[PDB]
C-alpha cells in the first residue's frame, strides 16, 4: 500500500491473532510465541471510532412535504419539483460514494502506517543487535530467551546489554 507493509513486504496477515490488530511472533531455543501489541492496535482502533462518530453525527434541518401523496400536483410545478429532487439525489449519491471511497482509502492506508510505525520502533530498539530479513522479521544475533523477547515487545529492551555478543556474531570476527 502507501506504506509498503500490509500487502507489501509482509507476505500475509495472521488469522491466528484474534488478540489485536498488530503483534509479534518469535522463534528462539525455547520455542515460539505470539503476542498482540496494544498501543499500535488502539491507535488504529481509535481513528476508526472517530470516523464512525463523524459519520453518524446528525445535521438536520426538518423538512415539510412539497409532494402530496394522496392528491394531485399541478403538472408544471410537479416536474420542477421532480427535476430538483433528482438533481439533489444525484448530488447526495455522488457525495456518499466519494465519502466512502476516500475514507476507505484512508482507513486501509493508516492501518498500513500503524503497522510500519511498530516495525520502525522495533528496528530502533534493537539497533546494532539485529538485522532485517526483508519479510518483517528481525534476525537477532544473540540469545534471546522468552523474557528477552518480552522486553522487546514491552519496549524495555536495553541494547547495550547485548551489544558486545551481538556485534561478535554479526562480524563473525573479534
Amino acid at each position: 500500500g502507501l506504506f509498503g507493509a500490509i500487502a507489501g513486504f509482509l507476505e500475509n496477515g495472521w488469522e491466528g491473532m484474534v488478540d489485536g490488530w498488530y503483534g509479534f511472533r518469535h522463534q528462539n531455543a525455547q520455542g515460539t510465541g505470539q503476542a498482540a501489541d496494544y498501543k499500535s492496535t488502539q491507535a488504529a482502533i481509535d481513528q476508526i471510532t472517530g470516523k464512525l462518530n463523524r459519520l453518524v453525527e446528525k445535521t438536520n434541518t426538518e423538512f415539510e412535504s412539497i409532494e402530496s401523496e394522496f392528491s394531485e400536483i399541478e403538472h408544471q410545478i410537479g416536474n420542477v419539483i421532480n427535476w430538483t429532487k433528482d438533481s439533489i439525489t444525484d448530488i447526495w449519491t455522488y457525495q456518499a460514494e466519494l465519502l466512502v471511497a476516500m475514507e476507505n482509502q484512508h482507513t486501509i492506508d493508516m492501518a498500513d502506517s500503524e503497522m510500519l510505525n511498530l516495525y520502525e520502533r522495533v528496528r530502533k530498539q534493537l539497533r546494532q543487535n539485529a538485522e532485517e530479513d526483508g519479510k518483517g522479521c528481525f534476525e537477532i544475533y544473540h540469545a534471546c530467551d522468552d523474557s528477552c523477547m518480552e522486553s522487546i515487545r514491552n519496549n524495555t529492551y536495553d541494547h547495550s546489554q547485548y551489544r558486545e555478543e551481538a556485534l561478535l556474531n554479526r562480524l563473525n570476527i573479534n
Partner: protein, 318 residues
C-alpha cells in the same frame, strides 16, 4: 533467534470500494445506507392527531367526518388516504396551498362571525349528502342561505366579519352552483345573482352558474370553496343576493406542527423524527434508500443499495 512483526487477517473478508479499487477486500466494514424502515407511525413523545377519514380541509368547513377535529392542539398531524373533505360535492380553489398551510400548523381555534339574517332568508339549508345523526344536515361552519319564500328573490344582504384578534384568521365561504335553472329560481329567485367579497387587501366576485353535470353523492349541483386570510384589525364584507354559503365560524391556525401522509398504523411506544408514506425511519446512518419523499429530520435519500465503510485494514489471508 528471530522476532517477526505482523497483523491480523480473517478467512471471511468483506468487499469495499476505494479511490483506486472497486473490489478491495478488508477485515471488517459497516453499512452507511439504511435499507430498513419501521412499518408504523412512531408517535412516542409527540402530541399527535390522527385525522382518520377526516381530510384537513374538512376541519375548516365542518364536514361530518371531521366533527371530532373541528378544533385542537397538536405537534404532529396525520392525514390518511381517501379522507373526506366534501359531503356535498364541490371543490376548493387553491386547495394544495390551503392543505399545506394546515399541515404545518400546531392547532386550530374556531371563532364566530356572528352573522345574522332576515326572516325572508332561511339560514338552515340542509342536504342528504351531509348526514349528521340520521338526519339531513350541512357543514358545521357554513350556512346554506336560501329564500324562505320558494321562488322569491333572495334579498340583497351584507355581512361583515371583523377580526378583533392580534393574529390573522382563515375564513372560508362557498358558492352554490345549481344544476338547473328551475332549482336556481326556486332557491334564490329569477334575479341576476352576484356575490362580492371585499376586505382591505382582498377583493373578488362570484356568480352562481347553472349547468348540467353528473351526480356525485346523488347531487348534480356543486359547491365551490374559496378562502383568505383576514389580518388583525381588518374587516371583510360579504355583499350577496343568493348562492353564498356563509361562514358561521372562522378558523385560526396556532403555531407549527409536522404534517404526515401515511396509511401506516400508529405506534405510541417507539420514537421517531423521520417519516414517509410507509412509516418511520430510525437510524444513526447518514443515508437511506427507502424513499425520496420523507418529512421531518431525515437521512439523505441515496440511489444505492449499499455503501460499505471499511472498519479494518486490508484482508491478506493465509
Amino acid at each position: 533467534d528471530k522476532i517477526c512483526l505482523g497483523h491480523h487477517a480473517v478467512a471471511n473478508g468483506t468487499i469495499v470500494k476505494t479511490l483506486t479499487n472497486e473490489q478491495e477486500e478488508v477485515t471488517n466494514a459497516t453499512e452507511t445506507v439504511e435499507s430498513t424502515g419501521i412499518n408504523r407511525l412512531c408517535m412516542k413523545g409527540r402530541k399527535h392527531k390522527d385525522l382518520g377519514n377526516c381530510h384537513p380541509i374538512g376541519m375548516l368547513i365542518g364536514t361530518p367526518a371531521c366533527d371530532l377535529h373541528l378544533t385542537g392542539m397538536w405537534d404532529t398531524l396525520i392525514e390518511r388516504e381517501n379522507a373526506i373533505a366534501y359531503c356535498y360535492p364541490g371543490a376548493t380553489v387553491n386547495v394544495e396551498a390551503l392543505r399545506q398551510k394546515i399541515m404545518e400548523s400546531g392547532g386550530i381555534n374556531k371563532i364566530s362571525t356572528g352573522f345574522t339574517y332576515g326572516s325572508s332568508i332561511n339560514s338552515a339549508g340542509t342536504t342528504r349528502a351531509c348526514m349528521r345523526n340520521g338526519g339531513n344536515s350541512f357543514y358545521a361552519e357554513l350556512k346554506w342561505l336560501v329564500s324562505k319564500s320558494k321562488g322569491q328573490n333572495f334579498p340583497q344582504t351584507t355581512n361583515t366579519y371583523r377580526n378583533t384578534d392580534t393574529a390573522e384568521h382563515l375564513i372560508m365561504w362557498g358558492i352554490h352552483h345549481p344544476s338547473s335553472t328551475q332549482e336556481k329560481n326556486d332557491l334564490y329567485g329569477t334575479q341576476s345573482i352576484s356575490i362580492s367579497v371585499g376586505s382591505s387587501t382582498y377583493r373578488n366576485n362570484f356568480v352562481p352558474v347553472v349547468g348540467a353535470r353528473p351526480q356525485v353523492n346523488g347531487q348534480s349541483g356543486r359547491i365551490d370553496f374559496h378562502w383568505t386570510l383576514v389580518q388583525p384589525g381588518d374587516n371583510i364584507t360579504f355583499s350577496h343576493n343568493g348562492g353564498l354559503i356563509a361562514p358561521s365560524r372562522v378558523s385560526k391556525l396556532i403555531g407549527r406542527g409536522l404534517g404526515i401522509q401515511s396509511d401506516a398504523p400508529i405506534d405510541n411506544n417507539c420514537e421517531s423524527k423521520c417519516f414517509w408514506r410507509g412509516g418511520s425511519i430510525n437510524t444513526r446512518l447518514p443515508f437511506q434508500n427507502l424513499s425520496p419523499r420523507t418529512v421531518g429530520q431525515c437521512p439523505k435519500y441515496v440511489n444505492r443499495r449499499s455503501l460499505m465503510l471499511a472498519t479494518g485494514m486490508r484482508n491478506v489471508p493465509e
